[PDB]
Design a protein around this ligand. Structure first.
Ligand SMILES: Nc1ncnc2c1ncn2[C@@H]1O[C@H](COP(=O)(O)OP(=O)(O)O)[C@@H](O)[C@H]1O
Ligand SMILES: Nc1ncnc2c1ncn2[C@@H]1O[C@H](COP(=O)(O)OP(=O)(O)O)[C@@H](O)[C@H]1O
Ligand SMILES: Nc1ncnc2c1ncn2[C@@H]1O[C@H](COP(=O)(O)OP(=O)(O)O)[C@@H](O)[C@H]1O
Ligand SMILES: Nc1ncnc2c1ncn2[C@@H]1O[C@H](COP(=O)(O)OP(=O)(O)O)[C@@H](O)[C@H]1O
Ligand SMILES: [Mg+2]
Ligand SMILES: [Mg+2]
Ligand SMILES: [Mg+2]
Ligand SMILES: [Mg+2]
Lengths: 349, 349, 349, 349
């Protein structure tokens, strides 16, 4: 039929989703208990729904749990701690976040026959490893969302021949840049996509064949498991605890505020940690270059375009240029590189 | 299980219907005899049934008749002339329109034990006049519809106590806004819907009381019978022959294409009649404003919200704004004001 | 490697085909039994195979048959009479023509693993009627062709999902001009191809929409079945016997030579029949114009570009101009309008 | 009859224009809100309507706004600030300046059944770069002007192919001197036209062939955006605060008074800035000495006669002579060179 499509991602740093109609949302993976918002309604109006997501989630048993979630929960000191957030794909923490972006990307008044061909993403070492667990949950995912301060609801339910599972970074270079660089890729060149994830960074390569079509190399491509931006939040956390000379610990919000700037305004003064920030990024820079060449022998010289993606690829790109300068480049929308890739390569159905 | 609900409208310009599950269809009120289609199927793929209603309808003899109806009938050279279309609500011209309106708005594989609360409509001055004529038709309406080139059939038959008649503009402002207009209605005010239709324009008012509940008045509210879009097509038909000066008179499509734009593509050229389109709309704007003061004395100053409706109100919303500017506003669906107004006020039972 | 593409036409006057590499062949639709040729080779050197198709064709018995086809068959006294030629698309008369059309349009030393997207054609009113007859023939067409005195052979066999049927005039104006006519089609206009062929004349229209995409109509478009060049040959055959007054009736060549010029070289003299050639063309011009008003009401004024096609349209382009002068124009290949229209609209897959 | 011809100039300094009847108007590009000049109507004679442009402008929804524009807007302190007027071609600010030029260049007793040809200009860089927007805005233009205090009006609207686009200063020497300078241009010489406008400055050249016919040279000719008379208002503005040292800034009127006079009468006394005036006048002349030679190497020696245009360079003619003295010259109407060059080369149609 005219059944719809929403491409989301389970990215532990920040959830990145897009519909079939190219409207796209982004919010961190932060949930909290939802509390009633009436006083703050009068001071500051909620124009951006994404900035202030308080929301209600009905279940199949017709109970409900309110949630400060996303940008709104990040302001809360009582949120989910998010730096030890569990990797379990069947967690209710994942259920709320998967219910969240669906509530923001289902348009108004769709026909219920026109269901949603949802497209997800799994890590490369986790795709075969954790396939049916998400297929268990998305089969069982049936709820009803209710937006606080916005007063619109969506019923949600998913079936087979609407669920569709792809690995992470699959359609990012299988399409939407493969349609463009096909004049440049000629014969048995290798394209290299490195999605710098928050927790885990994926490194995926495709070989173009005789027929200028991509074929996949699992023995040249894998996941930097635990290598990525989460170490920068981990190390720079310890870099303040000795520089403050107090044992003072920043919260979840200030740490995410830190590693975009490096200068947190602590007790009337900016504690400067620019020295360790350039150090830890170059610490992460070398940890990506060498470990990619654990999968890349002299075949690195068979590269035509080393592409990097993810939110972590943006702030590394100048230092992460040193994989192979003037051959490497950056994808256009680095965070949504999965999500735009999940859309077009999710249009196989 | 509970009984199903469909709210359609037999409006003279176009059939405007909606079901219980908030799915709506719209197509112009033109019928045509159906002819065999597999050839035009092959040239262009049919993704919309509404453009291409080739359809078979059984009767009391169980004899099928092929029909082109809706957009497909307008392109036919042999369709209904549509300017001399009958007002007899029990006519077969009204039956095939009502068959397709009930044919599209039923989903597949429903249980056959349940029945449907169908809610039709009448003109305001012709509700009492044409009450039993449609009551006789809906009791007589035993037909089985069969969509050619889509191949799904419906058995459409209704006994007593399932049909529900309302006048036009009845539940569009009594209901359908009552959850949102309740803060605007305060004490002894008049709300008013002005539906600009094909043959007629329709004026309906509702006095709200001290206890903030609307109640009807019939001497402030009537049907502008024969005054509507039909004065625009007949005037602009003469405007082409005044501008062609050849005796060439427009067909069914060319006149209907004209008053939507004003530039008929005649002999490789657009024949400009934008100014006469303004004049025919202004005389229609003359004949609704001056007739409103016939129904309204100083009580036009007793308004809190004028609403205008009809597809003819879409091109005239700023033009018919001169009744009471900065108080009149647009109904949220200009075509579907009557149908959803039939839906919410039909679910009151 | 990718699959090859050939677009031929089985037109009643002459086979008009073209391949993927834009090489075209044309020869009249006359077959003849082949006889041994080494003698006429010695008198005159053969630089054109099309004039001199002596050719052997294997079958399901793998039994070769010699054939003279094309220009070489027309000079034979014992060829097909060509006025009583069958319309049965699965006939061997159609097979040998289709064998040579596929025989010429394949270059030498192609890989045997790849297959060819062959695109044939049908009359418009006989597309649905003769759909499975050619589908049965193309599934049955297992033949090996062998060109005598040129000595290159082709193994021509096609399985399922390689043939592609289209009506005549389908892709000639839907495609083949769509990159150039897109600036001319603006809003709700009709383009029209008029192919003047041997047995029939063919009328096909396409309404463009508001979104500037053409869509087909079948009640404004049909096959002028039995009305075409065949009315000119039969009338001018009687025109010679009216002018010879001896009982001498023209043969296959003399009648075909006549209506191209009008002066058959009979007994050392040109017998003038130029005026009767004008009369037979004018009655054909009568029987396409008056039949056009049968398909077109005032919608002839809804044209932006008439196109005329067919080899019969070449001698009638200024003569059939009287439908709508200063708007009708000539297709860029009067013969090859259908074939390249099959080629571009066959490459859409 | 023949469709009426207009040629206007969209110059940001002052809007110029001339009609088919060769009557020409000029007024500054300043707008304001119109207010009821009825008190002064009793006091002083309102005869120069160009001095006194109070004007109402209807639209397609019949919602008018009053406008002081041009010379009457110069006396207003409430006018558009005009040092920061938007360079968008599709502004209402342009439309008010456009419609003012319309009703002044359409005299009474003319056939309004005949359409209106207009010939406008662009920046020479932006003639293709911002081409379609002016092509859109003129086709979108449909209003109705109302002349306050003079009580006549024009219906104002444009279809396509009545508007005509030629670049700034194109036809001023391509036409309008081509019947006179043909004796002067001999062989391989370059005529050169320099439009010293307010915001921008054009320099345009034409190679002539062997056959004494001009041809365009896009790489010896460009637009000097940010160079022109707006530098003189920019430089002398701070010179007043340099001279007065008060913190008082001149308004739009006093500043435009200053760079046409040089001696502002501030606070009961003439405050002198004549020394810095010529200093900027040499400086603007310096910036045209450079940038012309940036496109003119030794090919400047191949000239025959430079022309210069613009009201800015008109008072610069001695200092701007220094580029090529006694070969450069000034066009006779430095304001109306472009509009007559629009009109004369617009009289091809
Ligand atoms: N402007 C920015 N400044 C600093 N870090 C950023 C910025 N934008 C994104 N990031 C980092 O990138 C991460 C987002 O990665 P993302 O592409 O969402 O991968 P994942 O799919 O693993 O969540 C965040 O955790 C954040 O630290
Ligand atoms: N986009 C449009 N442009 C011009 N006219 C329109 C448009 N949409 C609707 N109309 C006019 O409105 C009429 C539809 O009125 P409608 O609300 O269906 O009333 P009714 O119930 O009497 O049929 C049509 O006949 C048509 O002329
Ligand atoms: N130069 C010509 N002079 C006269 N008649 C011609 C000429 N070229 C083509 N024709 C006529 O056009 C016919 C070819 O039509 P064609 O486009 O092949 O249609 P079809 O597809 O029906 O065979 C021939 O039978 C012939 O009579
Ligand atoms: N008599 C004058 N004295 C001083 N400056 C003048 C005079 N006449 C015109 N100008 C200057 O010339 C400019 C007019 O340029 P114009 O030819 O209209 O170019 P544009 O097409 O860019 O508006 C004005 O801004 C003004 O400063
Ligand atoms: Mg990721
Ligand atoms: Mg109605
Ligand atoms: Mg043909
Ligand atoms: Mg200028």
């Amino acid at each position: 039929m005219n059944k719809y499509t929403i491409a989301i991602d389970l990215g532990y740093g920040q959830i990145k989703g897009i519909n079939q109609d190219n409207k796209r949302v982004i919010f961190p993976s932060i949930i909290s208990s939802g509390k009633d918002r009436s006083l703050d309604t009068f001071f500051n109006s909620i124009d951006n729904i994404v900035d202030n997501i308080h929301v209600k989630i009905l279940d199949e048993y017709f109970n409900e749990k309110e949630y400060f979630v996303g940008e709104l929960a990040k302001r809360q000191p009582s949120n989910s701690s998010f730096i030890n957030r569990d990797n379990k794909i069947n967690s209710e923490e994942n259920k709320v976040l998967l219910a969240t972006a669906l509530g923001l990307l289902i348009p108004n008044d769709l026909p219920n026959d026109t269901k949603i061909h949802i497209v997800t993403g799994l890590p490369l070492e986790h795709f075969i490893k954790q396939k049916q667990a998400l297929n268990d949950m998305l089969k069982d995912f049936e709820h009803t969302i209710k937006f606080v301060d916005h007063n619109f609801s969506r019923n949600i339910k998913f079936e087979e021949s609407n669920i569709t599972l792809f690995p992470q970074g699959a359609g990012a270079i299988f399409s939407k840049i493969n349609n463009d660089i096909s004049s440049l890729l000629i014969k048995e060149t290798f394209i290299g996509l490195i999605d710098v994830g928050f927790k885990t960074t994926d490194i995926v390569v495709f070989r173009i064949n005789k027929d200028k079509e991509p074929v996949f190399e699992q023995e040249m491509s894998a996941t930097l498991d635990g290598l990525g931006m989460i170490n920068i939040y981990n190390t720079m956390d310890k870099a303040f605890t000795d520089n403050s000379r107090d044992g003072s610990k920043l919260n979840t919000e200030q740490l995410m505020l830190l590693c975009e700037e490096g200068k947190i305004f602590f007790k009337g003064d900016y504690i400067d940690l620019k020295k360790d920030l350039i150090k830890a990024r170059k610490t992460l820079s070398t940890n990506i270059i060498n470990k990619a060449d654990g999968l890349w022998g002299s075949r690195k010289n068979s590269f035509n375009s080393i592409m990097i993606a993810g939110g972590g690829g943006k702030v590394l790109y100048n230092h992460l240029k040193l994989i192979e300068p003037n051959m490497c480049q950056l994808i256009d929308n680095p965070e949504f590189a999965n999500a735009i890739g999940y859309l077009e390569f999710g249009k196989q159905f």
